[PDB]
């Protein structure tokens, strides 16, 4: 009778490689599918093909044109498929870009420097920005405008990568993206699983096609290492080898009809049971869902750790917050490079700060990320002073609290904060430091970044979850290429860093805490190999103090 | 055409209700399918009612008697299954048994402690070691002995329970040989993948049944606590509500339906691209893979930090090992019991100690996890000296790399040394210490306990993992059940502690920074939340020095 018998589908990307497979598996199993496009002719195309191969009746297959990114062309498309359909019974969540494939050095963020890129004849046809959109804002709209439309026993499938989890050389604009959806998936699935409709992450590894070799091939070339390298690398992290295509018993890569047939089981009632759980179709790639560890020691900190080295900080709305931790940092006898976004609260520090007499090593500035030239010119100024900056802290841009609601109900507003304040931020500070110790590359210790979470907003940290998992990627990225940049002499000092969430605690001494240890991980010689450290929920008991 | 044609399917504990359900999705989708039980008039009856309910012709059914226990019986039984069918396409390790229903402070050990808690009206029928050979031997033999008859495209099917994972009252003996499972089946992911053999986990939340309502209500009384709080413990980890049993929307259980269709799912070739995964079939519980971190510090101790306190270390088969941990205790002003398994030990330790010059503070005795009643006699002969035991040390029972061999060729003697010597002596030591603090419940400090794992084996700590998956789920028992005995005025003190993994590092001062994270954990004032604490693999780069 069809294991999706009289169901009505929404397949996002349905033009691409995977959604071509999901619509003729979902057709197959008895749906109605509609697909989605950007660009009318080619999802046309795409229906017109698939109605050829499958045999399928044309009422059971429509088409729609959505933009990620732009809420009215996702509110008509949905409307349009409600007024036809009445329902969406399963929302495949496909769509998706590349991005532009630039190490987090050169990644393009005005549409100027786009322009500059395709000069180089790079195949590169969008801003971080527009990556955002098309990766992660896609998800975030067309799941918030279907859900009411949804009914109960519904079912959201989200479709990232294992990428997603791995170091991807040049692939940042692409990784990042997809990691903020994963953390994103689990938080719909806690606000629409009490409503009766189940959220599900698909993670496809290394899809098989005739190219994918070779575009590991070249991806090899791009960095200077032997053609293999990329591809062994995700061979050496799966336990399960596989004949496929009549090919024998081998290291190989799982298939667009192995992603489709999950899609299906999920897509169908047999899965009901099943909310926020992840489907991992990677041969059994083996990463961790978070690389990570909790503080169990109280930062101990000498006063002469910080001589000769500069801690730059970038600094978000509260300022105030952003000193006490410079105080800890000039403490241990650093440098601080005090970056504030509004000129505004340069004038209420600078002054504030000769109240608590803090002159001595400390300079304020005006830092915004939203402009990064400024950023550029303003480090270059500061080290024309002849201290070169050692080590970077990152604060999240918005106030606390700033960014807030469901997922699903929270504004316009909320999803392009998180991708332009939070998200593209993040971006632009470490390509502007990932530029910075390009030129100042020979640094008394290796260069060091710490990036910081809020504090807990006590209302589930919805946003602090989603960047932490964002910040969480773009630092194995930024790890991995820096470490291979290096290994080939491109560099002379590898970048290494960590994040600090600080949401697991609501204690008062949690930022002279959180400061402590951004100060070992900055000015002390040190490799902290998980990437996530999070502040235990009770400081006293879980230290000595 | 059945999603299973043309397969042979072996269910083991195919009686149950769960079995039961399984074999009938199978027997739907075309599988040929061979019931294990270790009572044949049982598996016998429920083959005919299987034969009854579903259309299926006789053929496609047979039965055959496995114990788990019994290494032959499980030979004959798929020597059995290859004489009728040739092969296993799917093998479902779904047999076990509910174990005895006692916290930690009275598992039944011997036989005579099961006899005296039958006259006692409890339904117990199963010691400690019987509930390990049940719901963990069964596994490790079934899938050993049937692997080289799985065919590459073959699926194993380990069925546990989220409740591994979970704090879950008076049924430590149910829960740690299923934690012990888990890590197992994962390393039989790793061993089997290559051959490709997928091996996956499937963990089923608390499961539709009028008794586990009960059940519930049972646990609840257990406890102490109103009557619906277990139930609401667990609805309220669950993130999904669902229609079941023609009821409306609510916080319900997953059905024996909801386990099968997982089950057809991942016994077909649909499944080809999954190893090594887990499928929790929970409506999205909210338990963590593992609540864990690595030590970012070195252990700093102090010279008065211990005195008034005294430290039990139950020593294994390497004295030499724990008497350089009971330096570091003797360091800080404890005292020390050392516990010696072999009484020849004592005298040989006694010299070592005055050539190594440790005299005052320490005693030594004969302390044997194998003998209970001993443990128990010679910890209240040492505490009329007048200082009772505040913290306890657990180092592993057999000499390092005496427990080798992938798991699927390791001698016969090695589940067993595992399950009785590692696994069952574990539990004895925890039942130990309850008893203990139940007695002594007036602490200068509140009772601490540490277990330590082996060093590496350098082959994979196949066994390291194992038995610190178990261990993992054995603290969280003992935690949880002490910290609810304490609520409900039951016991002034809570009993806490942790698990320290050593095989995570190879660097020479590992035994002595394990030895002073032990030291901070058994004497400082604290309470470290995360249960598992690993060595980190370089100890000079994770902290400064």
């Known amino acids: 009778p069809g294991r999706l018998a009289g169901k009505i589908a929404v397949v996002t990307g349905a033009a691409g490689n995977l ?135 519904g079912s959201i499938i989200n479709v990232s990568t294992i990428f997603s989890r791995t170091p991807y050389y040049a692939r ?149 917050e952003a000193l006490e931790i410079a105080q800890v940092q ?27 007499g803090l002159t001595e090593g400390l300079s304020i500035i005006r830092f915004s990320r939203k402009d990064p030239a400024a950023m550029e010119a303003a480090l270059e100024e500061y080290t024309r002073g002849g201290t070169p900056i050692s080590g970077a802290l990152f604060m999240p841009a918005l106030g606390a609290g700033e960014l807030s609601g469901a997922v699903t109900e929270a504004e316009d507003n909320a999803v392009e904060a998180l991708m332009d304040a939070e998200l593209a931020g993040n971006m632009a500070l470490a390509r502007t430091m990932s530029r910075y110790w390009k030129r100042h590359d020979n640094l008394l210790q290796p260069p060091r970044f710490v990036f910081v979470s809020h504090a807990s907003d006590g209302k589930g940290d919805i946003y602090g979850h989603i960047l932490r998992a964002a910040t969480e990627q773009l630092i194995r990225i930024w790890r991995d290429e820096s470490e291979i940049d290096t290994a080939h002499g491109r560099r002379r000092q590898a970048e290494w860093g960590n994040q600090i969430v600080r949401f697991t605690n609501t204690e008062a001494e949690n930022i002279r805490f959180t400061a402590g240890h951004a100060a070992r991980i900055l000015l002390k010689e040190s490799k902290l190999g998980e990437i996530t450290l999070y502040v235990p929920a009770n400081i006293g008991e879980a230290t000595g103090a």
Not at 300 to 313: E, N
């Open 19 to 153: 959604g071509g497979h999901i619509v003729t598996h979902y057709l197959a199993e008895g749906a109605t599918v509609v697909m989605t496009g950007r660009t009318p002719d080619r999802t046309k195309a795409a229906a017109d093909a698939l109605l050829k191969s499958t045999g399928a009746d044309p009422s059971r297959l429509a088409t729609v044109a959505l933009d990620g990114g732009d809420i009215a062309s996702v509110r008509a498309a949905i409307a349009e498929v409600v007024q036809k359909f009445g329902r969406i019974d399963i929302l495949v969540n496909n769509a998706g870009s590349a991005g532009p494939k630039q190490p987090i050095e050169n990644l393009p963020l005005s549409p100027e420097e786009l322009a500059a890129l395709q000069k180089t004849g790079s195949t590169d046809s969008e801003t971080v920005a527009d990556a955002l959109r098309n990766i992660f804002g896609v998800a975030w709209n067309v799941a918030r405008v279907a859900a009411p439309h949804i009914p109960e026993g």
């Open 172 to 320: 940042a604009a692409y990784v990042v993206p997809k990691a903020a959806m994963n953390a994103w998936s689990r938080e719909l699935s806690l606000e629409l699983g009490p409503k009766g409709i189940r959220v599900n992450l698909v993670y496809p590894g290394p899809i098989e096609s005739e190219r994918i070799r070779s575009v590991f091939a070249a991806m090899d070339a791009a960095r200077g290492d032997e053609a293999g390298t990329t591809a062994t690398q995700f061979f050496d992290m799966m336990s399960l080898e596989r004949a496929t295509g009549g090919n024998e018993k081998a290291k190989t890569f799982p298939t667009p009809e192995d992603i489709a047939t999950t899609c299906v089981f999920l897509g169908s009632d047999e899965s009901a049971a099943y909310n926020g759980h992840d489907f991992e179709v990677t041969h059994g790639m083996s990463v961790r869902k978070e690389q990570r560890s909790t503080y169990l020691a109280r930062p101990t900190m000498r006063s002469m750790d910080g001589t000769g080295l500069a801690v730059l900080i970038a600094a978000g709305d509260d300022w105030e």
């Open 330 to 356: 000039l403490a241990c006898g650093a440098q601080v490079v005090l970056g504030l976004p509004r000129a505004a609260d340069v004038a209420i520090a600078e002054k504030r700060c000769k109240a608590l």
